[PDB]
């Protein structure tokens, strides 16, 4: 599975007369755990952002003046939110405590909004000393009329 | 399950939310050693507090007993009761302390001074005298007690 891509890249190098290199990495018992922790935290942040995108679009559709697809049959309205973060302004609140792990969630939540059609100019980040100050900063962030969803990352347990 | 630390936290959080002002709430955390130190300190403070309170009561009892005033009754059964009010208003006090073991006798003196002040005792009427040791207390106490503008004298020794 890994040799075939190298053979193809070698053949492409011979065909195109260009230097094409290919490289892999061998992992011991510990780097696997490190990478798994990083991937898990990134996935947690990704899901946290996705759950807010869906709720924002659900709010957009629920108050709208047009109904959409019914149930598996008909005569039963269904309301749901699309995973399209286009034109939505977000606000992220993170805690400086354990920043070496909170920043992983922050980075894994920004790129989801970017890849779902959102531009970085509509993202506002706020950092607070600890988890205790999260609600009172999220309150002031929500006070802004140019905010559609709030994502908050703490560090406990 | 504490019925105290939970309710204070809930009240402070709701107050901060309702008034939009930061209210940092921090408590102490002791484990089997700071608790003992604090208990010894508060025991010394209470010792000095009751030491001053008894003198206040005795002075007021002396004033009322030899005074010309119709006192109240127990419940309305005409049996008049003479007792000392815990209002140190107008009373003048003199404290004598020995600088031997000052790190504790000063806690005693401080726990007596605030006890006098909070009960209405004005700060102008408290006179403090320090002596090298307990063996010097009797003469200084005699000198303070001979004064006419002195209603009580409290003294602290060493151990």
Curated annotation (Swiss-Prot), chain A:
UniProt name for this protein = 6,7-dimethyl-8-ribityllumazine synthase
Which Pfam families does this chain map to? DMRL_synthase
Q: Gene3D superfamilies annotated for this entry? A: Lumazine/riboflavin synthase
Query: Which reaction equations make up its catalytic activity?
Result: (2S)-2-hydroxy-3-oxobutyl phosphate + 5-amino-6-(D-ribitylamino)uracil = 6,7-dimethyl-8-(1-D-ribityl)lumazine + phosphate + 2 H2O + H(+)
**Function recorded in the entry:** Catalyzes the formation of 6,7-dimethyl-8-ribityllumazine by condensation of 5-amino-6-(D-ribitylamino)uracil with 3,4-dihydroxy-2-butanone 4-phosphate. This is the penultimate step in the biosynthesis of riboflavin.
- In which residues is (2S)-2-hydroxy-3-oxobutyl phosphate bound? 36
Enzymatic class: transferase
Report the SS bond pairs: none
Family per record:
Belongs to the DMRL synthase family.
Supply the alphabetized keyword list.
Riboflavin biosynthesis, Transferase
User: Which pathway does it take part in?
Assistant: Cofactor biosynthesis; riboflavin biosynthesis; riboflavin from 2-hydroxy-3-oxobutyl phosphate and 5-amino-6-(D-ribitylamino)uracil: step 1/2
User: Which InterPro entries has this protein been placed in?
Assistant: LS (IPR034964), LS/RS (IPR002180), LS/RS_sf (IPR036467)
Any one of the GO BP annotations: riboflavin biosynthetic process
**What are the EC numbers?**
2.5.1.78
């Amino acid at each position: 599975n890994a040799s075939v891509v190298s053979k193809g890249l070698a053949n492409l190098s011979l065909e195109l007369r260009k230097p094409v290199t290919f490289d892999i990495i061998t992992a011991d018992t510990l780097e696997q755990a490190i990478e798994r922790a990083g991937t898990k935290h990134g996935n947690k942040g990704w899901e946290a952002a996705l759950s807010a995108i869906e709720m924002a679009n659900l709010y957009k559709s629920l108050r709208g003046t047009g109904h959409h697809h019914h149930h598996h049959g008909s005569s039963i309205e269904i309301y749901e939110g699309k995973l399209t973060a286009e034109g939505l302004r977000f606000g992220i609140v993170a805690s400086r405590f354990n920043h070496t792990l909170v920043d992983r969630l922050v980075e894994g939540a920004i790129d989801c909004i970017v890849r779902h059609g959102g531009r970085e100019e509509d993202i506002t980040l706020v950092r607070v000393p600890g988890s205790w100050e999260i609600p009172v900063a999220a309150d002031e962030l929500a006070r802004k009329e140019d905010i559609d969803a709030v994502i908050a990352f703490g560090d406990l347990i």
